[PDB]
């Protein structure tokens, strides 16, 4: 099975340099050109360039000529993109991608945030109903940078879930998630929001208890 592994999160200061990585497995690394794509907050796609891992040869969008450098490490089956003198204009999700046979394969993307604000862990609060179907909530308040991952019962509880886009309030993000189940299910069965904020090394589970 072809897979491309990218780190999910990178927060850096303006003016710094970063080396983004894309680790490949499940195919012959040197036989296929690697592509890199940029996607900015609420924007479209931009092609950055591609690289031939067999010999290092590259084609790069001239827009990124003094910004990005593509390299590969054969022996670890890893493609790299070096970005220099970072600005907020470089905050984006960066994807690596290949085509093997007649299938396309994508990394899950690195969310790169360029900011002088500091990593902040969120507070995670369970929301039970006030004192036929019941809705529970999970409030994830005050974190930086994006993203957080929120699941319910470690993902096994997926239907009836609404996880809302985060909003920014004084350099911190907040989001919430709702989940609706049948009144015979809760609280007789246990329901827990699982919240991960990799940037702050944060993983917490809040079981929803009746007030």
């Amino acid at each position: 099975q072809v897979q491309l592994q990218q780190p999910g999160t990178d927060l850096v200061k303006p003016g710094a340099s970063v080396k983004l990585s894309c680790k490949a497995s499940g195919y012959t690394f040197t036989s296929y050109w690697m592509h890199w794509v940029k996607q900015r907050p609420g924007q479209g796609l931009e092609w950055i360039g591609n690289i031939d891992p067999n010999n290092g040869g590259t084609n790069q969008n001239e827009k990124f000529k003094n910004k990005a450098t593509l390299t590969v490490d054969k022996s670890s089956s890893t493609a790299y993109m070096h970005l220099s003198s970072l600005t907020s204009e470089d905050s984006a999700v960066y994807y690596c991608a290949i085509e093997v046979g007649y299938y396309d394969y994508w990394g899950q993307g690195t969310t790169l945030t360029v900011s002088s604000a500091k990593t902040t862990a969120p507070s995670v609060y369970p929301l039970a109903p006030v004192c036929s179907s019941v809705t529970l909530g999970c409030l994830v308040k005050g974190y930086f940078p994006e993203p957080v991952t929120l699941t319910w019962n470690s993902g096994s509880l997926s239907s009836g879930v609404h996880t809302f886009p985060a909003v920014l309030q004084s350099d911190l993000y907040t989001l919430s998630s709702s989940v609706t189940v049948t009144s015979s299910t809760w609280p007789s069965q246990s329901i827990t929001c699982n919240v991960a904020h990799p940037a702050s090394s944060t993983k917490v589970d809040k079981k929803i208890e009746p007030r």
């Binding site: 790069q60 994508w106 609060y125 919430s176 709702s178 609706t180």
Partner: protein, 213 residues
């Protein structure tokens, strides 16, 4: 550089219909055009290559046509699951370039919001904050008016609203509304109300609680 133009940012359709998204290249690109689907918060997924060939596993409801400068992605038998963004791309010459993307939008039957209100959690109160959260879920159409009252008086300061995209399961919308207070402000009042008007009813949907219960 070659400019790919998807003139429609948005395109309305109904389920079961056929819809066509167009892309115009600024100079000739042969048939070296690809189409991609992107779910919010996910990596792109290639649909079509060489203008008309489906990648393997892509449903045959998706078809592509065109050559030269005018390219069309057609979706037959549109369904809720197609509520994504669609991108064209030319890979005829470097640098490869994308169109600006087209969002699909589905007309379905009206549906009233399910409204739930949540007092601050006990854990949050210990830390000195007080957030009151209101969910308004699975409604249609998108237009909805949310109003907060405290002790019977309208409150606008400190409210933040967030909307989901149109839902890929049932084409509805959902919304969260969060009133953020200090603990002192929260403990200084008793009644908290989230209220919503929507074209499905002649009267607001009202959810309320009293702090001292």
């Amino acid at each position: 550089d070659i400019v790919m133009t998807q003139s429609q940012k948005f395109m309305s359709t109904s389920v079961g219909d056929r819809v066509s998204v167009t892309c115009k290249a600024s100079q000739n690109v042969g048939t070296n055009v690809a189409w991609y689907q992107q779910k919010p918060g996910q990596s792109p997924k290639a649909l079509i290559y060489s203008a008309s060939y489906r990648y393997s596993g892509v449903p045959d409801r998706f078809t592509g046509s065109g050559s030269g400068t005018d390219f069309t992605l057609t979706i037959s038998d549109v369904q809720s699951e197609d509520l994504t963004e669609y991108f064209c791309e030319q890979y005829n010459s470097y640098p490869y370039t994308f169109g600006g993307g087209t969002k699909l939008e589905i007309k379905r039957a009206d549906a009233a919001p399910t409204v739930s209100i949540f007092p601050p959690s006990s854990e949050q109160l210990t830390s000195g904050g007080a957030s009151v959260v209101c969910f308004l879920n699975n409604f249609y159409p998108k237009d909805i008016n949310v109003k907060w009252k405290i002790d019977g008086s309208e409150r606008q300061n400190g409210v933040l609203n967030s909307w989901t995209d149109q839902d890929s399961k049932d084409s509805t919308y959902s919304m969260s509304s969060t009133l953020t207070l200090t603990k002192d402000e929260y403990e200084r009042h008793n009644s908290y109300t989230c209220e919503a008007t929507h074209k499905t009813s002649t009267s607001p949907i009202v959810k309320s609680f009293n702090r001292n219960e």
